[PDB]
Ligand binder design. Structure first.
Ligand SMILES: [Cl-]
Lengths: 244, 235, 250, 241, 111, 231, 240, 195, 243
């Protein structure tokens, strides 16, 4: 019968690893690098678009940085199509919470929910896991500014600074070297871009090969603003930090 | 791969035969039936000295007139015990009476072959079901994952089973007392166990018409162990 | 009976590759060349009508399809897969948008819905991925003109101009030299015909080429008068004659 | 190598089960031909009754799907009848739901979509048949639309299917290269059938008796099959000029 | 409107002796002011030395007796031909009756 | 070999190996004999024990007052199939006030077993059954194979060493068929028949199991000292 | 639905999927449980391969199931969340239907049952998680410590460890823990728990987590400095 | 059941609920506590159809307690009230709706403010300085409208509450057997044992 | 290779090997035949007497569908019974909705589509029987034969099983020597002869003859078994011809 053709996506190896999760992580290691850096007065999200073309319409393009709600955003590394399925589910979950409790969803609760969905595909159903790793950048009134990551295993952890995708080993070492606790957003912006500029597989880091975003309390008085940077604004910050 | 309900060329179900191998790796359990009662005894086999041995529950009450001992993958037994207890009490609800030991055993065995592609595999545990009813008196049954159950005058299951069964072959007779049966279980358990038998790594129990099913205290069993040592040294 | 293939047929290999998606992309590579170019006041999509037999009436086989009045689609790869995707794309534009908001979806969101369907065939039980890449051109009020590519994985990217299928590598190079941000629709059509001639072997005329545009509103194609706000579809398929006229000024 | 057993992609981007379903199409060793007249559409097919114990009246690969639509099948009879039953049900359902007779091209598309699903879903196998639908459509006129196991379909001026399809196809191609029109310029369907038989004789290089052929004719508002005696009358006319 | 219930009349009487028991019932069956039968048995031997009568709506009465007789048969199959005691039969009948708590057997029953 | 992984696969010679392997389980089972006259039908079964402390596995199951069977192979499968027969016999009585014909009972068993041989996921039954009964057309004996094949016979035997008993009945055919109105003599012929399949062991009081049904005889099973008369 | 039997017996009578789930537990960070005379302490290893971590928001290794019961684990982190959620739901479901909080033994029996169910259900794999469940029964001052594992077996322990290098710390506990006289105070119980982890951990900085549970729903997690004082005192006595 | 009152003062919320339970023509109990603690700083009183009230209250309690354990965090009174409202709005279009009216008294530890929410069985939520359900408001609101200030102390709130109960005891035909009074403030929930 | 391990898989030839293996089970079975006569049909089958213990005339193989259709088959007997059970459901639902008894060609397609459905999936096995069936309807007599693939045609005479070649040769002679046709009573006699002649392929064990027929004149268009004197007359005619 059908058993003959079943790859069995949800089994342990003799060593106690999940085959498909490990292979999904291998896929993600070839995706464009995404970096998240948390500061005292905000969060930075920086990400590299993969080998683009001159004929790609950049100003209307989005492959890395997505908005979940007004307070929370994500950086993507892996299959974009897989990420959009999960992103739309997360957007709905945030709205369900808001309707139920009349309060914006705490960051961790949203992260846990998405991570539980990923977990399910590794334990039951016989389907392949989502080949996606997220960096969650968000704010709430309990823990303030928060960075999280999740991977195909459904495991998630909190971070001060973190990278996903390609060259994370090199990127994490550079972040660990220059990061400090009393750092500010403008400094974190510079660190993120400098790290990408050194870890990139491309010849040079330009505006057309980047997506950038900040989450600041740099919004008029006690409130939070999300800023998805435009192509011209990425070009300006590259000149300001002295990369181009 | 291959079906879970597949027959071998010899006419046996692969999975059922493989579950029997798991039961051979389990700790020893022995049952002896007499006209004064049925005795059930088990090897606890703690994996470490820090493990509190009294939490090892390999002898279990199904009803006041029915007890049960297990050997093999003991986690699998919990749903079987739950079904047995439910069956026993449900019959009491429907018929205002105790349920026959054979009927209880048959109900447990009906679960056994409910596996395929229902549960995904057979149970990896064997059960010794001991009890008393008015029709057939004191009884001891061996319930396997094949769905088969045999009645026994005496039976051993687990790792030291074939050695213990040969010993039960010679020792059992139709005029055994309850006290004689108790010492006989302790004797054979002590023979097949790796570690030295004491009140902490071995457990006794019995079922009588008067008092029903009772698990023995460690103090009560300790005396029976001391009584055993002296009578073996007596000749 | 029952569909007993409830498990994924596309899985990650040790190297991190999704085999069935890669193989679907290979099927797209074998397919006939199709392209799309975006102008300031319109978009053009084009492909070759590779007729399987001269006895076959190639007019009955439509490679360029209307999805909404302002959105059109063309493909490279497996034709039957494309045909069913067009059926689903047309329906989802109504069920998940028009019946809710009372208007047709914007290009990017219809593309997103088609992409979702293609992603699900990459993960759901007992199915293979679609063996096509789509080029979807369209217009809407707030986003203006746009051109999108959709791949077997479900990934989609916006393009100023691009090509897919047989001679895509050469065609994309040809488009890079000719494209600028000041092109008028007629200039884009001219470039489309030039680019498409390179990948075509045999006859090159209005009967062997299929070409459509997203441009100005066509009140003559609306079918009714009396409502000022309804001005007609922006999608228009060029006739055999209209193509031949532009091949003389080629 | 399980990519050759079910309908998933091979490394070359191919579906081997679809390709092997195409090969099953020629298992019957029968050739069919379809042409269009002014007012009609004619389909002819070889008839072979190898066993004397068979009832020759029940041996047929031409089906009356609806009153307007006829279908000839190239492939094994079980799959042929499977497709026939489904097409009849679809044609009847269409008329009930939408209030008018299902067009030939719409039915072809519907059956082609069903075939496409078998190429994408693993649990369903492709049918090893090629389906040639014929009618005189009320909007499009004389119509020939053909479906295959890949889920491909297209309209035709004329067509041929079977082991020797290429010989018949080229023969028809050459005639339409001369006449420079998309049909047989003839008033009566009787003469269009005579054309169809004549050009199959020329292409295959074999003579036919009344029991060697099977003929279907589509006119406005009805499709019908010819009896052996109707075909005999057709063969006599061919021989007398 | 359809009335699923009816009244077939009849009367039954059970008396327990010291070492015996009697279950009596009249044999008349009726609807409204008509006689259906002058002899329609109402008290039945159900096996295992148990007698039973379900008086009231005859269709429900026949159904209940039929199901209890069946319950006796399966009690033998399931429990090694054990005799069904009168107390066990009584408890079994309670569960047969309460299964239709929300669409009851319209009968007064005696065993 | 490559075609015995499941029941849904024919071999190149048109064989169903899983069904054949199920048939093998019957041959491993203990012997049981069936035979009939025109008035009565008899089952005789050699019960098997695990060891000297164990009981002897029951072989005969009652299905109705006028019908029952004996088993050889997987006992739980016999419980499933006998339960089905009990229900079918019972459906016939409750709905039609009609005792289920033995021939129809065989047809129902055939069809139930067949469904397990043509579908994926399931398995064939691993037991053989000998059904006896007395209905409106007199005494009957049936042999059930889990392939689905059911056969009406004068006499037969299944299980290990069953060929010896089957040959004996084939010789005695003309004699035992005429044993009308004499239950004891018909059982004697059955006990003598099953004796042709014994080696090393002999028929003891807790070894032998006998069942009988007839004209004015409900299906009854004899075990223990009730069969000492026939030893 | 996906019904495929993933956990099945092998010729030698082993269920490999369940055994490979134990290998996932072996890979997980070390967890330890020690019960004193009037308390239970749960110690957990934090691997220092991950720095730049935000320790405020990162999922803690010890989870409260109810106000009087806690659960720690070793193995797959994502898998543990599913067991914890189910346990928390069952705890509230018990309070709602029986009007008493769960006993530690009952909660353990439930979690162990869930794990067992996933070893003979179609289309699912076993949990790659072993748990240590600790607490005090309502209106009871006797400490409770249980362990569960993927197969679904559970048992009570005077002291136990699970996870990577658990063989070493169990070796330590077996020679250091006396049953006749368990750690009489909170200090002695915590000290013995930290000592046991120092056999395996590496640095005694942010790698050791300690959670003390006392009777009557008194649960507290020690801070870095409080634990660091134990680490300091242990090694100063060791220099002799 | 019958009577439930609520008043939000400067630094606390006070809930008063009747003690009577009646079956048929007989008063079965005169010490019934018509309230459940949802969280340490949130109390819910309830009144409606027999059975449904306690069932609904305990169901809400279980859900909030589950949330508290999962997040190790207490939901704000506003968040709890919205959750409760949704459950009742969900319930009113069910096969058999839960016929329960509630008052939710909570102290928001973040804002350092007491909060009183009134929700009826339809899912009609309103935040109020004082509230009631059923006929209770018909007798008491005129007194509250007159005497209520937002800067009142807890002691003044209790005195105004006594006046409300006295008016009820005078003009209501039903004997509700007095009230149990509970106070919700920054320190948590406590019962006034003499009233 | 591996194409023959799963049902519904096309080999590179375009063949379904699992169906071809089902044909081998049919070829292994006993001989069964069908003869179309002037106003009806006759069915006959070879029943191998494996042992003396078999009760004569009891193990009936030919099956009736509705009251006007007869069915016989060679191969796996249980598979044949399953197919007839379905046929009976199909015939009942046809008569329920349309009132008239199911026409034979209509009935033939109902079986054909069902058998063909068991070649579409790997979760089912093809039928291990070839079925000969037919009867009388409003348009007269019809005889059909249905294979494991779902393939069926109308026949003047039909044969399947181990002795099919011998039977077919005999049937071909009757078709040639009787172009005007054969009577029902003649067809019964000829059917007996052909089964006896076809028994040379199964000559080890002796056999029992079983015949049935539907005829407009002889049975009023209803299916009936040939019994008693008419059966013995056919056996005598058959025995006379082999000697
Ligand atoms: Cl369609």
């Amino acid at each position: 019968g059908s058993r003959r053709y079943d790859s069995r996506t949800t089994i342990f190896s003799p060593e106690g690893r999940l085959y498909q999760v490990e292979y999904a992580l291998e896929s993600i290691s070839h995706a464009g690098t995404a970096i998240g850096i948390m500061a005292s007065d905000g969060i930075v999200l920086a990400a590299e678009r993969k080998v683009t073309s001159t004929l790609l319409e950049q100003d209307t393009s989005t492959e890395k940085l997505y908005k979940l709600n007004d307070k929370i955003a994500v950086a993507v590394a892996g299959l974009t199509a897989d990420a959009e399925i999960l992103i739309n589910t997360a957007r709905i979950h945030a709205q369900n919470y808001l309707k139920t409790y009349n309060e914006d969803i705490p960051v961790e609760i949203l992260v846990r929910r998405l991570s539980d969905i990923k977990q399910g595909y590794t334990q039951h159903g016989g389907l392949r896991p989502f080949g996606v790793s997220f960096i969650y950048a968000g704010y709430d009134d309990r823990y303030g500014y928060q960075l999280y990551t999740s991977n195909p295993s459904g495991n998630y952890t909190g971070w001060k600074a973190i990278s996903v995708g390609a060259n994370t080993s090199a990127a994490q070492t550079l972040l660990q070297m220059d990061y400090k606790d009393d750092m500010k957003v403008d400094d974190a912006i510079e660190l993120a871009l400098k790290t990408l500029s050194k870890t990139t597989d491309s010849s040079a880091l330009t505006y057309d090969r980047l997506e950038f975003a900040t989450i600041r309390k740099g919004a008029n008085d006690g409130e939070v603003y999300q800023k998805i940077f435009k192509p011209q604004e990425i070009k300006d910050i590259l000149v300001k930090t002295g990369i181009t | 791969d291959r079906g879970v309900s597949t027959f071998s060329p010899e006419g046996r179900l692969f999975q059922v035969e493989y579950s029997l191998e798991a039961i051979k790796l389990g700790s020893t359990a022995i049952g002896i039936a007499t006209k004064e009662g049925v005795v059930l005894g088990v090897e606890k086999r703690a994996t470490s000295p820090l493990l509190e041995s009294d939490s090892i529950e390999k002898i279990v009450e199904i009803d006041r007139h029915i007890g049960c001992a297990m050997s093999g993958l003991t986690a699998d037994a919990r749903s079987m015990i739950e079904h047995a207890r439910t069956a026993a009490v449900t019959h009491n609800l429907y018929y205002d009476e105790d349920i026959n030991v054979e009927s209880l055993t048959q109900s447990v065995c009906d679960l056994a072959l409910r596996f395929g592609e229902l549960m995904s595999r057979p149970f990896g545990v064997a059960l010794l079901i001991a009890g008393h009813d008015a029709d057939d008196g004191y009884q001891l049954f061996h319930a396997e994952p094949s769905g088969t159950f045999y009645r026994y005058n005496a039976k051993a299951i687990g790792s030291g089973s074939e050695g213990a069964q040969a010993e039960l072959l010679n020792e059992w007779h139709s005029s055994l007392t309850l006290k004689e049966a108790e010492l006989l279980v302790l004797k054979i358990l002590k023979q097949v166990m790796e570690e030295k038998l004491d009140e902490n790594n071995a457990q006794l129990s019995c079922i009588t018409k008067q008092d029903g099913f009772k698990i023995y205290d460690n103090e009560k069993t300790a005396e029976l162990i001391k009584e055993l040592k002296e009578k073996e040294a007596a000749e | 009976m029952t569909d007993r293939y409830s498990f994924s047929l596309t899985t990650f290999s040790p190297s991190g590759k999704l085999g069935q998606i890669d193989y679907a992309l290979t099927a797209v590579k074998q397919g006939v060349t199709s392209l799309g170019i975006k102008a300031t006041n319109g978009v053009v999509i084009a492909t070759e009508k590779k007729s399987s037999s001269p006895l076959a009436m190639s007019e009955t086989l439509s490679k360029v399809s209307l999805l909404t009045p302002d959105i059109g689609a063309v493909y490279s790869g497996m034709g039957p897969d494309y045909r069913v995707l067009v059926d689903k794309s047309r329906k989802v534009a109504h069920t998940s948008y028009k019946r809710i908001y009372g208007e047709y979806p914007p290009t990017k969101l219809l593309v997103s819905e088609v992409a979702k369907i293609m992603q699900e065939a990459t993960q759901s039980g007992g199915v293979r991925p679609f063996g096509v890449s789509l080029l979807i051109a369209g217009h809407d009020e707030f986003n203006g003109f746009s051109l999108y590519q959709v791949d077997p994985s479900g990934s989609y990217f916006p393009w100023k101009a691009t090509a897919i299928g047989k001679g895509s590598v050469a065609a994309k190079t040809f488009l890079e030299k000719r494209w600028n941000d000041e092109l008028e629709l007629e200039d884009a059509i001219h470039i489309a015909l030039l680019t498409l001639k390179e990948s075509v072997e045999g006859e090159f005329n209005g009967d062997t080429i299929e070409l459509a545009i997203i441009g100005d509103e066509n009140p003559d194609l609306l079918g009714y008068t009396g409502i000022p706000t309804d001005k007609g579809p922006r999608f228009r398929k060029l006739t055999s004659q209209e193509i031949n006229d532009r091949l003389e000024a080629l | 190598g399980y990519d050759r057993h079910i309908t998933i992609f091979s490394p070359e981007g191919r579906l081997y089960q679809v390709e092997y379903a195409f090969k099953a199409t020629n298992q019957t060793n029968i050739n069919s031909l379809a042409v269009r007249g002014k007012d009609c559409t004619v389909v002819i097919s070889q008839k072979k009754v190898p066993d004397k114990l068979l009832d020759p009246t029940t041996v047929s690969y031409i089906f009356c799907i609806s009153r307007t639509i006829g279908m000839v099948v190239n492939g094994p009879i079980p799959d042929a009848r499977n497709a026939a039953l489904r097409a009849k049900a679809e044609a009847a359902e269409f008329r009930y739901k939408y209030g008018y007779d299902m067009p030939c091209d719409v039915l072809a598309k519907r059956m082609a979509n069903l075939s496409q699903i078998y190429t994408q879903r693993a649990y369903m196998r492709p049918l090893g048949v090629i389906l040639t639908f014929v009618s005189v459509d009320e909007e499009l006129g004389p119509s020939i639309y053909k479906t295959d196991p890949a889920g491909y379909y297209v309209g035709y001026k004329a067509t041929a299917t079977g082991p020797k399809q290429q010989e018949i196809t080229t023969n028809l191609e050459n005639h339409f290269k001369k006449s420079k029109i998309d049909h047989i310029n003839e008033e009566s369907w009787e003469k269009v059938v005579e054309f169809a038989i004549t050009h199959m004789i020329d292409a295959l290089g074999t003579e036919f008796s009344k029991n060697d052929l099977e003929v279907g004719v589509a006119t406005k508002d009805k499709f019908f099959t010819l009896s052996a005696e109707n075909i005999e009358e057709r063969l006599v006319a061919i021989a007398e000029q | 409107q359809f009335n699923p219930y009816g009244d077939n009349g009849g009367t039954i009487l059970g008396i327990a002796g010291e070492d015996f028991a009697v279950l009596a019932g009249d044999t008349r069956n009726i609807t409204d002011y008509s006689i259906n039968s002058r002899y329609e048995p109402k008290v039945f031997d159900c096996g295992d030395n148990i007698v039973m009568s379900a008086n009231g709506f005859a269709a429900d009465g026949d159904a209940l007796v039929k199901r209890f007789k069946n319950s006796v048969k399966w009690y033998h199959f399931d429990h090694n031909d054990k005799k069904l005691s009168i107390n066990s039969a009584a408890r079994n009948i309670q569960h047969l009756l309460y299964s239709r708590r929300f669409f009851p057997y319209y009968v007064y029953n005696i065993i | 070999n490559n075609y015995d992984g499941d029941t849904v696969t024919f071999s190149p010679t048109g064989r169903l190996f899983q069904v054949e392997y199920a048939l093998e389980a019957i041959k491993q089972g203990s012997v049981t004999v069936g035979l009939r006259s025109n008035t009565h039908a008899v089952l005789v079964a050699l019960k098997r024990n695990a060891d000297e402390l164990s009981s002897y596995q029951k072989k005969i199951i009652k299905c109705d007052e006028h019908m029952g069977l004996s088993l050889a192979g997987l006992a739980p499968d016999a419980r499933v199939l006998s339960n089905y027969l009990r229900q079918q016999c019972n459906y016939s009585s409750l709905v039609f006030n009609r005792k289920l014909a033995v021939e129809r009972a065989g047809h129902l068993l055939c069809d139930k077993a067949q469904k397990n041989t043509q579908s994926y996921g399931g398995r064939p039954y691993g037991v053989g059954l000998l059904i006896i009964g007395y209905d409106k057309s007199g005494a009957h004996l049936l042999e059930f194979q889990p392939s689905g094949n059911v056969t009406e016979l004068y006499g037969t035997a299944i299980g290990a060493r069953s060929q010896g008993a089957k040959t004996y009945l084939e010789r005695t055919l003309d004699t035992f068929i005429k044993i009308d109105g004499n239950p004891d003599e018909l059982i004697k012929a059955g006990v003598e028949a099953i004796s042709q399949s014994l080696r090393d062991e002999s028929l003891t009081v807790d070894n032998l199991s006998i069942a009988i049904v007839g004209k004015d005889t409900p299906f009854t099973i004899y075990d223990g000292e009730a069969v000492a008369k026939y030893i | 639905g996906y019904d495929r039997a993933l956990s099945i017996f092998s010729p030698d009578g082993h269920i490999f999927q369940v055994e490979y789930a134990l290998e996932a537990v072996k890979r997980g960070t070390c967890a330890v449980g020690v019960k004193g005379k009037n308390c239970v302490v749960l110690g957990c290893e934090r691997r220092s391969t991950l720095k730049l971590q935000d320790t405020r928001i990162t999922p803690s290794k010890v989870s409260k199931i109810d106000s009087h019961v806690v659960l720690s684990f070793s193995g797959l982190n994502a898998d543990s969340r599913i067991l914890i959620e189910k346990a928390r739901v069952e705890a509230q479901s018990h309070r709602l239907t029986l009007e008493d909080p769960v006993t530690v033994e009952y909660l353990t029996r439930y979690v162990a049952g869930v794990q067992q169910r996933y070893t003979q259900s179609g289309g699912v794999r076993p949990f790659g998680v072993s748990t240590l469940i600790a607490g005090f029964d309502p209106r009871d001052d006797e400490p409770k410590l249980y362990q569960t594992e993927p197969s679904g077996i559970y048992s009570s322990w005077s002291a136990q460890t699970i996870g990577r290098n658990s063989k070493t710390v169990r070796e330590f506990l077996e020679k250091n823990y006396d049953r006749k006289e368990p750690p009489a105070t909170v200090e002695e119980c915590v000290k013995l728990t930290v000592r046991s982890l120092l056999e395996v951990v590496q640095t005694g900085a942010k790698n050791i987590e300690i959670t003390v549970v006392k009777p009557d729903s008194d649960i507290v997690a020690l801070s870095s400095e409080e634990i660091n004082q134990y680490v300091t005192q242990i090694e100063q006595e060791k220099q002799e | 059941m019958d009577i439930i009152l609520g008043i939000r003062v400067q630094d606390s919320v006070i809930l008063a609920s009747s003690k009577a339970v009646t079956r048929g023509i007989s008063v079965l109990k005169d010490s019934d506590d018509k309230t459940r603690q949802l969280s340490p700083h949130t109390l819910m009183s309830f009144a409606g159809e027999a059975g449904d009230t306690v069932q609904f209250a305990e169901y809400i309690q279980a859900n909030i307690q589950l949330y508290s354990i999962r997040e190790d965090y207490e939901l704000s009174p506003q968040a709890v009230s919205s959750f409760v409202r949704q459950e009742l709005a969900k319930s009113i279009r069910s096969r058999r709706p839960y016929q329960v009216n509630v008052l939710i008294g909570g102290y928001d530890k973040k804002k350092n403010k007491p909060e009183l929410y009134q929700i009826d069985y339809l899912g009609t939520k309103v935040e109020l300085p004082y509230g009631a359900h059923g006929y209770s408001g018909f007798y008491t609101f005129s007194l509250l409208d007159h005497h209520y200030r937002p800067d009142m102390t807890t002691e003044e709130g209790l005195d105004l509450l006594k006046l409300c109960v006295q008016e009820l005891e005078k003009r209501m035909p039903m004997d509700f057997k007095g009230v149990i009074v509970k106070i919700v403030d920054k320190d948590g929930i406590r019962q006034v044992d003499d009233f | 290779t591996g194409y023959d391990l799963s049902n519904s898989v096309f080999s590179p030839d375009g063949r379904n090997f699992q169906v071809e293996y089902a044909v081998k089970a049919v070829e292994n079975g006993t001989t069964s035949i069908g003869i179309k006569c002037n106003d009806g049909v006759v069915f006959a089958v070879e029943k191998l007497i494996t042992s003396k213990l078999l009760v004569p005339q009891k193990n009936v193989k030919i099956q009736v569908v509705d009251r006007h259709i007869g069915c016989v088959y060679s191969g796996l007997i249980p598979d044949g019974r399953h197919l007839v059970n379905r046929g009976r459901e199909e015939a009942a639902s046809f008569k329920k909705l349309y009132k008239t008894p199911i026409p034979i060609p209509a009935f033939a397609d109902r079986l054909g589509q069902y058998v063909q459905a068991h070649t579409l999936y790997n979760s089912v096995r093809p039928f291990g029987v070839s079925t000969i069936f037919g009867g009388v309807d409003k348009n007269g007599a019809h005889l059909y034969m249905l294979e494991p693939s779902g393939s069926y045609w109308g026949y003047k005479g039909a044969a399947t099983g181990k002795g099919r070649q011998s039977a077919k040769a005999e049937l071909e002679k009757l078709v040639d020597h009787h172009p005007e046709g054969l009577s029902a009573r003649e067809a019964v006699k000829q059917a007996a002869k052909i089964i006896y002649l076809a028994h040379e392929d199964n000559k080890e064990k002796d056999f029992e003859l079983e015949i049935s027929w539907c005829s407009l004149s002889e049975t009023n268009g209803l299916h009936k078994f040939v019994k008693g004197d008419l059966l013995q007359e056919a056996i005598d005619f058959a025995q006379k011809e082999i000697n």
